[PDB]
Design a protein around this nucleic acid. Structure first.
Ligand SMILES: Nc1ncnc2c1ncn2[C@@H]1O[C@H](CSCC[C@H](N)C(=O)O)[C@@H](O)[C@H]1O
Ligand SMILES: Nc1ncnc2c1ncn2[C@@H]1O[C@H](CSCC[C@H](N)C(=O)O)[C@@H](O)[C@H]1O
Lengths: 122, 375, 227, 375, 227, 122
RNA sequence: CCAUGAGUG
RNA sequence: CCAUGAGUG
RNA sequence: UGUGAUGAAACACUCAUGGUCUGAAGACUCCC
RNA sequence: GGGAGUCUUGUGAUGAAACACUCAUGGUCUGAAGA
């Protein structure tokens, strides 16, 4: 897929899926593509997660651009259904965002700091 | 570990302390630097940077740009980036000077002469690629149509109030503006109205007589031919502008199937162009959530609700879509919400260079519409 | 008419025919005005009338800018150069010795900035998004003053980012706060405080906070020093 | 003593008690009654009134209308009026009936059938005399001219914005909108500019090279002929529009010298026309105080001061007078006040049918302008 | 849908498809509408929907007008007839037997009053100035109701002058007080006290005072009896 | 002059000027054409005084029309200098208005009633 | 609609 | 500018 | 200079940039 | 009233103030001082 800028290992992918869940419980998230876009424009998002099996792709292709303008880190997970069922939904979702990490602060800080290393940051 | 600097000045390597390890100065040539500054935007390494990585043969390289990092890896080295590194600052702290040190110029006097005329030339160039965007024409065009739309309405309203000094009965007898305009334009004095030139317009025989009887029985004023030919200047223009609009709607369609097919597929060229005008470009419309597209064009209404916690606009310029202004009041809100959703997908598939997919986008949309209507 | 120096370098006030007082800067390119301003000769020198109502910096001064870090021979990064109104006047001030870099991502408007930038070797046009200081990185040096008048919701966050690229340590930053372009909901006076704290948690030493009214409604400029 | 009534029904005489002394019924004829209805407006008694003044030969007669009294005195009688007299009242209280009683109609049924048709036709006639006024064309003409003024300006700003996608530098090179649209009309591509089309415009040779160089080094966008034609449709309309204005301008000049010579003499045809549009007519303009004419057209500022007790506007549309907007703030007020003053004098001679006196008024005006400027 | 009489003659209410209640009158000229109003058939009779927002009379009715002096066959003089919206409806009310004389001095508007006056023998159009009843003296009779809806600063005086010509004793005057057209500075509510006193000095007996808001802003209608 | 509808006997013309004067002292008056125009427009003038020797005739011509619209009586004086010098000015005046008679009530009420007899009113 | 920078008749 | 009545895109 | 002295906020537009709704429910069907 | 499934739905359910214009009427500054 081409809106996929960098590469996510399933350990990295999973820490996300857990990370989302704790943020429904202990923090604040926004679920859905339209809300994730508004979440970025607004600089509320601390971490943006994008599914890899979206069709058509161009639906979420704009998120990488936006996230750099607002300097918000982005990560991929492999299935959209999987990201939704994390989200407290029983249908799929192509992208989601954490505004408040909560009792996943330590967990998110690990991911957001790991995708930087795979992105070549010192 | 070598920190790599890239500047108009050339290509520089540093040790971690900030001491100049090695350099390869660029040629004092506007032409090549301008192209390479544009290339480095896409991640392409300076050609002079390529040489410097050959002389020194580094274990670890770190660049200023994260976009450069993969290019130099494809070239064989291990690369990372640090955005605001202490080395990059050190380099530039010494830039009034190290321009002279590596002999890019003799003195400060004309390094600044150059960097000024590079900058004039580097941005002269960027100014041009902006002008080359195709959606700009679409935007300007559709702006001009709405300008003709307005004018026509204005000139039409004027002619009628004016031409009614002579023939007041024609105004409420001809609903349509262009039609009215032709009648003022071909005839003049009401007493020249004839079945033949009037059967030439297409007027059914019944309306023609209703017209001719009214012309006979008009309590309007007997008025000179100068007055009348003066009014006719306006009537003709109304006619020119309709012909011109009809040309611009046709031009616009051309640019609009070209630059944004799916949007067009959904809402047509005029309305779609219109959203491009409002968003500013195609790439700005692409980045919008639907919640904006839905309210684009209701900014008085929008922020009124936003400042006060009041009721929001249901729809913006989107009001123009047939389904929306015709369906009863309670349905507009949902239709709009559904259109905007598709529009944003559509805008996004169009900008990020997707091929036409408008058939299912319409199909999906009429589904969401048919459901709404059955309640 | 009478013209005399003010407490700040290369900046003057004028006594006039009626008994009126207007700021001005010493005209670097005589016989030439970037907007419509009066040109005035006094003892055979030409100065440019500096409308405060148009330029944020003249406002800040006429609203009491205690001290001014932009002077004769200063190097500046000017985010949001636009058509070139204010940057043409800082060209008059920094005056050939010193240099000014103009970042502006709006081409319709850089179109007229080109003109102002031809006539003046002070000014270095750069068409870029100040959100990516990487894209103009390879043309500038470091600067003393970072003048930021850009219309953005994170204009300050941007400013801080550009800062950690190009602001010499102990340089002064003039950051312009647009309340109504950060949020039209919030009370402007609430915003300045909330943004000034942004600069101070990122260790700028707020020297002075100036409210531009009436020169510019819902506007404030902060001067702070970078550490 | 005999009290006298005038109506469609005819002419009737009453003693003060309210008994019909003698009557002479009107003809139940639309054409004739209408006329005598228009005539009784100017004092002319019905013909039926003159006969009735003869059958009984009354020492004291009294009528409803005061314009009739001088006419009936000229027939030899002693005449006055009591406007809303007990008799006139007693007369109409019985109008359902006394139409039949003096045998004007057989029954109540077709007295109204007729009185309706007279009412229809009496006013239809007045509707016509009104549309027939000379000043309406003066007003409609200049309102329309101003409608064109606005339009030309709008398209010109569109066209500048639009053409500059292709050729930006041209915008700042031609102040005049008409000159600029003319360039785009004739040439199209920026590369078709030739010296002779440029010397034909009136362009001095120095400008000519600045333009041809500008086109050469342009950082503009290269564009299709379809794109150029689009722009040029807008360009060509701008030119058309410039012509029509001048035609209208001439048309207006005549009218404004015909219906209102004196007012035209002071401020020129349009502004005179303009003030005719705001007042609504010449006769309504004539009855105005100067203090109103002075501010006509600044209704927003006026009612702002009057609502709030703040400061009032110095000038309305009167601002357009060359002397006013060239002159400084403190002179404007004195110039407006003086001008408006001369204007009511100009207007009043016009409406109340005075012959031309515009010269000394101007003299008087320019004098006061001079006293004012000499301070 | 259901249509039923109201307390006032030839004026009706509708139960509707949804349950909104709107005023209407029995259409004197079936299949024909004077503004855009809805035509509604019930048990084979046609009524005209009477929008209160356009017509002041329907407002006063919808605001609790005690008694309506306009009924089957009333003879009414209606000053300021304008386009014929309201006067078309009082035609429906008076019903061929009754007669309505309509004054209006703006030619631009009598133009459409004409159209309305043609289909309706109820209506006797007059392009005239209500300030000079000498002009329409020769076409009209005396009247039961004097409906005065004119935008004039001396509108009350005009009404009065018109009354002592055409108003039967113990006859009624409905006078619309248009405040903002009387004086834009004064409080609308002060205007009303002063105008009713005017009525009360000319031996008019103020019967009811209604405010038309929200249907017409800063507007009031007075129903009073002339003695 | 032609804008004068009727003829004023000088016993009435003079009793006019005197009624003006008592109204400066005990009442309220207005002087000049533009102000009369407003005092007529506003229904403030009870009596409106217009000169017969005005030049050019058209300046004050609208007042008869106006006054008949607002049903405000109007009267003529023979000399313009005198009407102005009556007003407490040392210059002429083309028209004036009494707003409040003050101690010319009985005096005015008599004029407006004599100018009525000369107008053919019962 | 608000704010800011450039312009028109 | 406010209020009223008639309409257009 | 009352045939108006003094005071004193005329109107129509274009471009650029930012501020640009809500967020999980809605319709149906079968058992006693 | 208790239990129970089905279709649509974060690729967006529910709620919810799009905008541009013309005509007609009226409300339409101060009032004796100025060089
Ligand atoms: N993201 C961004 N990067 C650079 N410039 C921007 C920007 N966003 C907005 N701007 C520009 O900032 C300008 C603000 S007006 C300020 C101009 C300058 N301060 C002067 O006084 O002359 C606008 O013209 C706008 O085009
Ligand atoms: N002096 C006068 N004589 C006759 N009509 C007048 C008048 N002054 C104003 N008018 C008219 O009064 C009208 C008020 S609008 C009236 C609305 C209408 N009566 C209805 O309810 O349907 C305006 O059209 C105006 O033209």
């Amino acid at each position: 897929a081409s809106y996929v800028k960098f590469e996510v290992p399933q350990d990295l992918a999973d820490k996300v899926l857990e990370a989302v869940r704790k943020a429904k419980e202990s923090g604040k998230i926004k679920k859905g593509t339209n809300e994730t876009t508004k979440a970025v424009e607004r600089g509320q998002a601390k971490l943006v997660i994008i599914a890899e099996d979206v069709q058509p792709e161009e639906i979420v292709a704009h998120l990488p651009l936006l996230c750099d303008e607002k300097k918000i880190p982005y990560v991929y997970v492999s299935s959209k259904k999987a990201l939704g069922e994390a989200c407290g939904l029983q249908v799929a979702t192509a992208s989601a965002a954490i505004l408040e990490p909560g009792e996943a602060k330590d967990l998110v800080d690990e991911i957001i700091k790991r995708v930087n290393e795979i992105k070549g940051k010192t | 570990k070598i920190y790599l600097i890239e500047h108009v000045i050339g290509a520089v390597a540093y040790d971690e302390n900030g001491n100049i390890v090695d350099y390869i100065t660029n040629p004092r040539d506007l032409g090549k630097i301008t192209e390479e500054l544009l290339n480095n935007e896409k991640g392409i390494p300076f050609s002079a940077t390529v040489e410097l990585l050959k002389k020194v043969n580094p274990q670890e390289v770190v660049v200023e740009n994260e976009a450069e990092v993969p290019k130099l890896q494809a070239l064989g080295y291990r690369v990372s980036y640090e955005p605001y590194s202490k080395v990059s600052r050190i380099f530039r702290e010494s830039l009034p000077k190290v321009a002279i040190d590596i002999k890019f110029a003799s003195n400060e006097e004309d390094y600044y002469n150059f960097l000024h005329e590079l900058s004039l030339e580097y941005t002269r160039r960027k100014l041009r690629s902006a002008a080359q965007k195709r959606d700009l024409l679409a935007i300007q065009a559709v702006r001009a149509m709405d300008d003709i739309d307005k004018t026509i309405n204005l000139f039409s309203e004027r002619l009628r109030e004016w031409y009614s000094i002579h023939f007041p009965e024609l105004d409420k007898l001809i609903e349509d503006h262009e039609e009215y305009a032709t009648i003022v334009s071909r005839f003049g004095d009401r007493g020249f109205l004839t079945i033949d030139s009037l059967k030439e317009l297409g007027f059914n025989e019944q309306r023609i007589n209703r017209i001719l009887d009214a012309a006979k029985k008009s309590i309007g004023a007997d008025i000179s031919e100068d007055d009348l030919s003066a009014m006719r200047m306006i009537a003709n223009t109304i006619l020119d502008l309709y012909n011109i609009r009809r040309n611009l709607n046709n031009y616009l369609e051309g640019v609009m199937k070209e630059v944004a097919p799916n949007v067009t597929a959904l809402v047509g060229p005029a309305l779609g162009a219109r959203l491009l005008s409002i968003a500013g470009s195609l790439d700005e419309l692409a980045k919008m959530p639907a919640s904006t597209i839905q309210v684009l064009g209701a900014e008085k209404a929008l922020f009124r609700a936003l400042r006060s916690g009041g009721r929001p606009p249901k729809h913006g310029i989107i009001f123009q879509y047939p389904a929306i202004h015709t369906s009863p009041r309670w349905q507009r809100g949902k239709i709009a919400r559904a259109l905007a959703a598709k529009l944003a997908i559509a805008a996004r598939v169009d900008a990020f260079s997707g091929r036409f997919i408008g058939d299912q986008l319409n199909e999906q949309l009429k589904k969401r519409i048919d459901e709404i209507k059955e309640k | 008419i009478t013209v005399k120096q003010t407490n700040m370098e290369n900046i003057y006030e004028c006594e006039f025919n009626d008994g009126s007082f207007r700021l001005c800067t010493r005209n670097l390119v005589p016989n030439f005005n970037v907007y419509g301003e009066r040109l005035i000769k006094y003892e055979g020198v030409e100065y440019r009338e500096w409308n405060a109502f148009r330029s944020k910096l003249a406002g800040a001064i006429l609203k009491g800018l205690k001290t001014n870090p932009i002077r004769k021979g200063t190097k500046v990064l000017y985010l949001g150069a636009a058509s070139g109104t204010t940057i043409s006047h800082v060209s008059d001030i920094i005056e050939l010795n010193g240099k000014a870099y103009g970042v502006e991502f709006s081409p319709r408007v850089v179109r007229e900035l080109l003109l102002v930038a031809q006539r003046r070797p002070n000014i270095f046009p750069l068409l870029a998004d100040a959100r990516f200081p990487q894209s103009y990185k390879s043309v500038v040096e470091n600067v003393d003053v970072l003048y930021v008048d850009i219309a953005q919701p994170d204009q300050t966050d941007i400013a801080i980012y550009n800062a950690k690229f190009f602001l010499k340590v102990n340089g002064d930053m003039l950051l312009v706060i647009k309340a109504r372009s950060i949020d039209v909901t919030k009370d402007p006076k609430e915003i300045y405080k909330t943004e000034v704290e942004k600069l101070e948690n990122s260790n700028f030493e707020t020297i002075q906070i100036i409210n531009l009214d009436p020169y510019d409604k819902d506007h404030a400029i902060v001067l702070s020093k970078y550490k």
